[PDB]
Design an enzyme around this catalytic site. Structure first.
Site, PDB file in Angstrom:
ATOM      1  N   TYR A   1      -7.247  -5.786  10.548  1.00 38.80           N
ATOM      2  CA  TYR A   1      -6.094  -4.988  10.129  1.00 38.80           C
ATOM      3  C   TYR A   1      -5.849  -3.810  11.062  1.00 38.80           C
ATOM      4  O   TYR A   1      -4.709  -3.534  11.443  1.00 38.80           O
ATOM      5  CB  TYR A   1      -6.307  -4.500   8.690  1.00 38.80           C
ATOM      6  CG  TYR A   1      -5.308  -3.499   8.142  1.00 38.80           C
ATOM      7  CD1 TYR A   1      -5.495  -2.127   8.296  1.00 38.80           C
ATOM      8  CD2 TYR A   1      -4.207  -3.924   7.421  1.00 38.80           C
ATOM      9  CE1 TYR A   1      -4.586  -1.210   7.771  1.00 38.80           C
ATOM     10  CE2 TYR A   1      -3.287  -3.012   6.879  1.00 38.80           C
ATOM     11  CZ  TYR A   1      -3.473  -1.655   7.061  1.00 38.80           C
ATOM     12  OH  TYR A   1      -2.550  -0.760   6.519  1.00 38.80           O
TER      13      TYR A   1
ATOM     14  N   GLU B   1     -12.633   1.790  -2.962  1.00 46.15           N
ATOM     15  CA  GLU B   1     -12.541   1.007  -1.745  1.00 46.15           C
ATOM     16  C   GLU B   1     -12.067   1.890  -0.592  1.00 46.15           C
ATOM     17  O   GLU B   1     -11.243   2.781  -0.797  1.00 46.15           O
ATOM     18  CB  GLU B   1     -11.580  -0.196  -1.950  1.00 46.15           C
ATOM     19  CG  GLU B   1     -11.665  -1.251  -0.879  1.00 46.15           C
ATOM     20  CD  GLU B   1     -10.605  -1.069   0.193  1.00 46.15           C
ATOM     21  OE1 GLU B   1      -9.699  -0.264  -0.049  1.00 46.15           O
ATOM     22  OE2 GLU B   1     -10.727  -1.645   1.310  1.00 46.15           O
ATOM     23  N   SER B   2     -12.583   1.599   0.611  1.00 43.37           N
ATOM     24  CA  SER B   2     -12.287   2.383   1.841  1.00 43.37           C
ATOM     25  C   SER B   2     -12.580   3.858   1.548  1.00 43.37           C
ATOM     26  O   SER B   2     -13.685   4.140   1.043  1.00 43.37           O
ATOM     27  CB  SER B   2     -10.876   2.164   2.333  1.00 43.37           C
ATOM     28  OG  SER B   2     -10.591   3.008   3.440  1.00 43.37           O
TER      29      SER B   2
ATOM     30  N   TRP C   1      -0.608 -11.407   5.974  1.00 45.23           N
ATOM     31  CA  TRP C   1      -1.042 -11.100   7.334  1.00 45.23           C
ATOM     32  C   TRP C   1      -1.385 -12.392   8.082  1.00 45.23           C
ATOM     33  O   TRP C   1      -1.678 -13.421   7.462  1.00 45.23           O
ATOM     34  CB  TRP C   1      -2.250 -10.165   7.309  1.00 45.23           C
ATOM     35  CG  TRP C   1      -1.960  -8.801   6.815  1.00 45.23           C
ATOM     36  CD1 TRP C   1      -2.139  -8.338   5.539  1.00 45.23           C
ATOM     37  CD2 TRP C   1      -1.449  -7.692   7.577  1.00 45.23           C
ATOM     38  NE1 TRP C   1      -1.770  -7.013   5.457  1.00 45.23           N
ATOM     39  CE2 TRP C   1      -1.339  -6.590   6.687  1.00 45.23           C
ATOM     40  CE3 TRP C   1      -1.072  -7.520   8.914  1.00 45.23           C
ATOM     41  CZ2 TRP C   1      -0.871  -5.337   7.096  1.00 45.23           C
ATOM     42  CZ3 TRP C   1      -0.611  -6.275   9.323  1.00 45.23           C
ATOM     43  CH2 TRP C   1      -0.514  -5.197   8.411  1.00 45.23           C
TER      44      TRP C   1
ATOM     45  N   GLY D   1      -7.327   6.066   3.474  1.00 46.81           N
ATOM     46  CA  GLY D   1      -7.738   6.869   4.615  1.00 46.81           C
ATOM     47  C   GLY D   1      -7.836   8.360   4.369  1.00 46.81           C
ATOM     48  O   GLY D   1      -7.913   9.130   5.333  1.00 46.81           O
TER      49      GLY D   1
ATOM     50  N   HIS E   1      -9.435  -5.968   5.654  1.00 44.59           N
ATOM     51  CA  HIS E   1      -9.836  -4.807   4.874  1.00 44.59           C
ATOM     52  C   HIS E   1      -8.912  -4.607   3.689  1.00 44.59           C
ATOM     53  O   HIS E   1      -7.687  -4.594   3.841  1.00 44.59           O
ATOM     54  CB  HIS E   1      -9.807  -3.592   5.800  1.00 44.59           C
ATOM     55  CG  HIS E   1     -10.297  -2.327   5.193  1.00 44.59           C
ATOM     56  ND1 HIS E   1     -11.635  -2.096   4.925  1.00 44.59           N
ATOM     57  CD2 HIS E   1      -9.645  -1.175   4.896  1.00 44.59           C
ATOM     58  CE1 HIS E   1     -11.784  -0.872   4.446  1.00 44.59           C
ATOM     59  NE2 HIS E   1     -10.590  -0.288   4.422  1.00 44.59           N
TER      60      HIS E   1
ATOM     61  N   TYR F   1      -3.835  -2.016  -8.279  1.00 43.26           N
ATOM     62  CA  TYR F   1      -4.853  -1.310  -9.059  1.00 43.26           C
ATOM     63  C   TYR F   1      -4.569  -1.355 -10.558  1.00 43.26           C
ATOM     64  O   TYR F   1      -5.149  -0.570 -11.318  1.00 43.26           O
ATOM     65  CB  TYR F   1      -4.996   0.151  -8.609  1.00 43.26           C
ATOM     66  CG  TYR F   1      -5.204   0.353  -7.111  1.00 43.26           C
ATOM     67  CD1 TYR F   1      -5.991  -0.517  -6.363  1.00 43.26           C
ATOM     68  CD2 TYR F   1      -4.609   1.420  -6.455  1.00 43.26           C
ATOM     69  CE1 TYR F   1      -6.164  -0.324  -5.009  1.00 43.26           C
ATOM     70  CE2 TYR F   1      -4.769   1.615  -5.112  1.00 43.26           C
ATOM     71  CZ  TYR F   1      -5.541   0.753  -4.393  1.00 43.26           C
ATOM     72  OH  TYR F   1      -5.675   0.976  -3.048  1.00 43.26           O
TER      73      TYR F   1
ATOM     74  N   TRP G   1       0.813  -1.205   0.000  1.00 42.35           N
ATOM     75  CA  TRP G   1       0.000   0.000   0.000  1.00 42.35           C
ATOM     76  C   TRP G   1       0.848   1.257   0.000  1.00 42.35           C
ATOM     77  O   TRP G   1       0.298   2.359   0.010  1.00 42.35           O
ATOM     78  CB  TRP G   1      -0.949   0.012   1.211  1.00 42.35           C
ATOM     79  CG  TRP G   1      -1.734  -1.268   1.387  1.00 42.35           C
ATOM     80  CD1 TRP G   1      -1.507  -2.252   2.314  1.00 42.35           C
ATOM     81  CD2 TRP G   1      -2.854  -1.707   0.606  1.00 42.35           C
ATOM     82  NE1 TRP G   1      -2.423  -3.265   2.164  1.00 42.35           N
ATOM     83  CE2 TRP G   1      -3.260  -2.958   1.123  1.00 42.35           C
ATOM     84  CE3 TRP G   1      -3.560  -1.162  -0.466  1.00 42.35           C
ATOM     85  CZ2 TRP G   1      -4.339  -3.670   0.599  1.00 42.35           C
ATOM     86  CZ3 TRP G   1      -4.624  -1.866  -0.985  1.00 42.35           C
ATOM     87  CH2 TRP G   1      -5.004  -3.109  -0.459  1.00 42.35           C
TER      88      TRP G   1
ATOM     89  N   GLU H   1     -13.568  -6.860   8.511  1.00 44.25           N
ATOM     90  CA  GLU H   1     -13.238  -5.472   8.210  1.00 44.25           C
ATOM     91  C   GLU H   1     -12.312  -4.867   9.258  1.00 44.25           C
ATOM     92  O   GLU H   1     -11.476  -4.015   8.934  1.00 44.25           O
ATOM     93  CB  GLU H   1     -14.529  -4.657   8.086  1.00 44.25           C
ATOM     94  CG  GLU H   1     -15.346  -4.953   6.825  1.00 44.25           C
ATOM     95  CD  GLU H   1     -14.698  -4.331   5.575  1.00 44.25           C
ATOM     96  OE1 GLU H   1     -13.700  -3.601   5.738  1.00 44.25           O
ATOM     97  OE2 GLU H   1     -15.174  -4.558   4.440  1.00 44.25           O
TER      98      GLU H   1
END
Ligand SMILES: *[C@@H]1O[C@H](CO[C@@H]2O[C@@H](C)[C@@H](O)[C@@H](O)[C@@H]2O)[C@@H](O[C@@H]2O[C@H](CO)[C@@H](O)[C@H](O)[C@H]2NC(C)=O)[C@H](O)[C@H]1NC(C)=O
Ligand SMILES: *[C@@H]1O[C@H](CO[C@@H]2O[C@@H](C)[C@@H](O)[C@@H](O)[C@@H]2O)[C@@H](O[C@@H]2O[C@H](CO)[C@@H](O)[C@H](O)[C@H]2NC(C)=O)[C@H](O)[C@H]1NC(C)=O
Lengths: 535, 530
Positions: free
Chosen positions: A332, A199-200, A434, A119, A442, A130, A83, A329
């Site tokens: 994380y 998303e998010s 993870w 966020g 998430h 993506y 990310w 969700e």
């Protein structure tokens, strides 16, 4: 020269690149400038449209990632690094990407437009997960994604002032969407069939374009993955936005607290970008998870009311929307501040740690509100079981920030005219790095929606390739028709409604219809808790 | 003449009667006076001990029922009539009854003392369902039951006043327990082994004697069936007691505390009864006008406070509930309910009923109840709404007060035994949708199914014999269990184990509606304070 890689848009001529994909070639125009660079005096200001240019701009690689905080909690861990930015940071970042079939379609082709999450403080359209080539090659759509400013650069607000009006990151998104209407036909895309998806914070962004009339004429359908504009993290009020902007300025020496807004933003414009980022997290009013310093502000402009109010008050006839969540969700988020949590142990917390985590995960609420949370999420036949406490705090965080905002949106839109389809994504990727106790965390549906398992370079199972192809078909079916179902002997995906509340499970097994997006939990967050906070 | 039926107690001589049971005879002394008749100037006053008498008081029949409202909701229906008075009404009603084996035991026999329920507004020791003859014959106990003043006559309070001090019905019970200490040995009873047991307001009465030091020395073990002193209906505060006493006076033509009670004392008893329900502050079920008052005397604090603050080491207590505590009450005011249809209510009726079953709470508190008792996958299903409102009333008034009592007492030194009574009587006249309703374990505890005159099954007779054994075992030892062969575990705040009582063997389960009772016992108090 290859005529398939040259396109003329309103601003000038472009040269693209031809991309190999497992199923055939795709044309990619990457790093198309759509705004003037928001540098120097233009920091914090609304985007200006890109001025026309002579000659040919090479749109042959992703442009810079917008300045943003970089995660270092697990250095070198793939689960966090995926990310993080994969291009240099720059305020010179307002570029977008178009993927189209090769050769260019000859009749107008439906367009999917991706808005990433992060966020509202991070993210980039260039991230490997993506990559638009597989969607375009598998479903013969046009795919567009844009960069938009994040952090203070996108969302610092001194409401009322013209120098830092807030929400310019959403205006970056809107400007890109206007770019799609004016220019996407030059790539073979149909400006009358544009589906937003994200998303998010990307999903909350999608939702905000639904609730802002100037954006509403720029698209036709919407997909909200694991996010909603009414999330308690997605917007902030005018006063708290001002307090955060003012404390950031104070923390970096401006003015030499408060005063003239024009002087204060002018002093902010002189600080190196990285200095702002280094202080970004320090403006939050308490220790928290799932809270972010600079987010869309409700000031009457982009949003005339709160997203909850506009959702309750809106006529949504003619709208088709596809909404959903992943199975876990909240997991994380717990390793970013809830006491006793780690990706590197079983995180089998104690009752005292659970009760403390309730205040981290539900920040800035009354003691009584915290007690209402403990009541509903405690199993009183097993009040201290560490395993059960772990999954309960996960559910607290997941329900409060994602599941129940999605559920409220889905049910309200359905009851006020919209055709709504809802999913729960339940497959844990074989490659997931993870720990097992986080489940399906998430964000980990995205790689399947974009078809990343088709990448031969990667090590997904054959069934996961089948599954990604299934999901890509659903998303594209929804984009072309407003309906994910296949235009036979395949189990059907029914509309979600406020009464029956049906959704489908997405995993390696066939569609399974179920009822209720955590309905008992979400009655607490959406119906009762608001009343408790008002009294 | 039969010497086994003549006994001399401190006040004089008594003649009893011999009673038949399918297992043999029993001695019964019925209508023994234990207080001076609380008549005329003595209305609302604490009981005075019965002055001695010459001659032989006839103790061969039940004495009068204390003045009380009579249920007329289903005239002639067995389901309500079995709780109505079966002797004339009189304020001259302070008598008690003793049942003993025949011939009277000659060595000390353990004593069970029954305190009847009836919302503190009704009840009588003479009801057929409280007949002590089977328990005494089958389990060789001495059984005592007393009448105590109810309604205004037992519990009207003008706190501070000497003329209507409140709680005199509770003092009626205490005096009977003092009578048992002084006189029960004359019948073969052991005053050093006295077990209190009661149902509904009777269980709340038992619990109040646990929490009042002057009573705590008059008995040794306690049974609380479907009732608890911390029930939201079992006590009233000084100010609201004064308001209710004052509004009763107004409703019957009466105007200074002394002048007010003097005028109440002139009114015929039945006139007071006729306005009793009208002093309640709102439409409700499971609320009663004149109940024990917390004024510092009988109860130095609220029963909830005394429970949390008490050292209960050395106490054995047996508490439990029936399967459908709330069902009975819904037909006395919840919209859409009747015993004569399925009571398949609508969501609007459910929401209205919530304010009836949870009276005098803030709108926010009611919403919290609706959140907890709604299935949000089926918010409007009539059958589930019926069951949920029963659960609201049952949990709020009985199950969760009992759960709190049990958990706190266990966690502070008491040995606690908990049960859920899950058998629906073949004889039950209430509709099938009411389940096992409030009060319908009592006939099994008293062994009424052994009466050949009645139409119970062979298994129900065996079941009654099992229950009498459990209760009597507890009275003798503090432990309901029989020598080993499935065992009944103590209830604890953590494991929260209890047993189901029905035609099948004991089955151990966990939690007295722990999810619901966390709401009523842990969260709702905090919400109401803010
Ligand atoms: C699980 O991990 C947390 C977090 O600690 C980190 O991860 C561990 C695997 C180990 O490498 C620690 O040194 C890491 O810091 C543990 O909680 C921490 O406990 C330490 C001291 O005991 C404390 O200083 C930290 O603040 C704690 N972190 C919190 C509360 O978030 C937790 O105890 C671990 N569980 C175990 C070992 O069972
Ligand atoms: C079930 O009965 C209640 C109560 O009604 C009484 O008992 C019935 C058997 C019948 O004889 C009724 O006429 C009696 O009044 C019903 O609720 C009542 O509805 C009437 C309208 O007809 C209204 O005037 C009353 O106020 C209501 N009473 C209460 C206590 O709410 C209820 O509708 C019946 N349910 C059915 C038929 O499904």
């Amino acid at each position: 020269e290859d005529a398939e890689l040259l396109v003329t848009v309103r601003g000038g001529r472009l040269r693209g690149i031809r991309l190999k994909t497992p199923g055939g070639p795709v044309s990619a125009f990457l790093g198309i400038p759509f705004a003037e660079p928001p540098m120097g005096p233009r920091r914090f200001l609304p985007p200006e449209p890109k001025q026309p240019w002579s000659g040919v701009v090479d749109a042959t690689t992703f442009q810079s990632v917008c300045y943003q905080y970089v995660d270092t909690l697990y250095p070198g861990f793939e689960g966090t690094e995926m990310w993080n930015p994969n291009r240099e940071l720059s305020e010179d970042c307002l570029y977008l990407n178009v993927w189209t079939p090769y050769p260019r379609p000859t009749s107008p082709t439906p367009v999917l437009v991706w808005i990433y999450g992060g966020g509202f403080y991070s993210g980039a359209s260039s991230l490997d997960v993506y990559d638009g080539r597989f969607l375009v090659q598998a479903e013969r759509t046009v795919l567009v994604s844009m960069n938009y400013r994040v952090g203070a650069f996108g969302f610092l607000a001194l409401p009322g002032s013209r120098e830092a009006p807030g929400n310019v990151g959403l205006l970056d998104q809107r400007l890109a969407l206007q770019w799609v209407q004016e220019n996407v036909a030059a790539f073979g895309g149909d400006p009358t069939s544009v589906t937003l998806f994200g998303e998010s914070a990307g999903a909350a962004s999608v939702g905000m374009h639904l609730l802002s009339p100037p954006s509403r004429g720029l698209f036709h359908r919407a997909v909200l993955q694991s996010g909603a504009p009414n999330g308690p993290w997605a917007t902030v009020g005018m006063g708290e936005a001002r307090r955060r902007a003012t404390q950031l300025a104070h923390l970096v020496g401006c003015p030499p607290t408060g005063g003239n807004d024009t002087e204060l933003v002018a002093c902010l414009r002189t600080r190196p970008a990285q200095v702002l980022v280094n202080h970004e997290w320090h403006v939050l009013p308490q220790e928290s998870v799932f809270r972010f310093s600079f987010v869309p502000v409700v000031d009457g402009d982009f949003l005339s009311d709160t997203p909850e109010a506009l959702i309750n008050a809106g006529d949504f006839h003619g709208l088709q929307v596809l909404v959903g969540v992943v199975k876990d969700e909240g997991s994380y988020f717990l390793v970013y501040g809830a006491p006793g949590f780690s990706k590197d142990n079983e995180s089998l917390i104690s009752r005292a740690e659970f009760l403390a985590g309730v205040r981290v995960g539900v920040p800035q609420v009354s003691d009584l509100a915290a007690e209402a949370v403990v009541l509903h999420y405690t199993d009183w036949l097993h009040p201290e079981d560490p395993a059960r406490l772990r999954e309960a705090l996960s559910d607290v965080v997941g329900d409060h920030n994602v599941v129940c905002p999605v559920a409220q949106l889905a049910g309200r839109l359905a009851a006020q005219g919209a055709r709504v389809y809802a999913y729960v994504f339940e497959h844990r990727a074989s490659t997931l790095s993870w720990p097992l106790w986080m489940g399906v965390p998430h964000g980990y549906e995205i790689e399947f929606i974009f078809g990343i398992p088709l990448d031969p370079s990667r090590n997904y199972t054959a069934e996961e390739k089948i599954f990604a192809q299934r999901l890509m078909r659903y998303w594209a079916n929804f984009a072309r028709t407003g309906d994910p179902n296949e235009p036979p002997k395949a189990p059907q995906w029914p509309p979600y409604t406020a009464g029956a509340q049906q959704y489908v499970s997405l995993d390696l097994r066939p569609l399974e219809v179920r009822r209720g997006l955590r309905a008992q939990a979400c009655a607490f967050w959406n119906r009762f808790l608001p009343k408790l906070l008002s009294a």
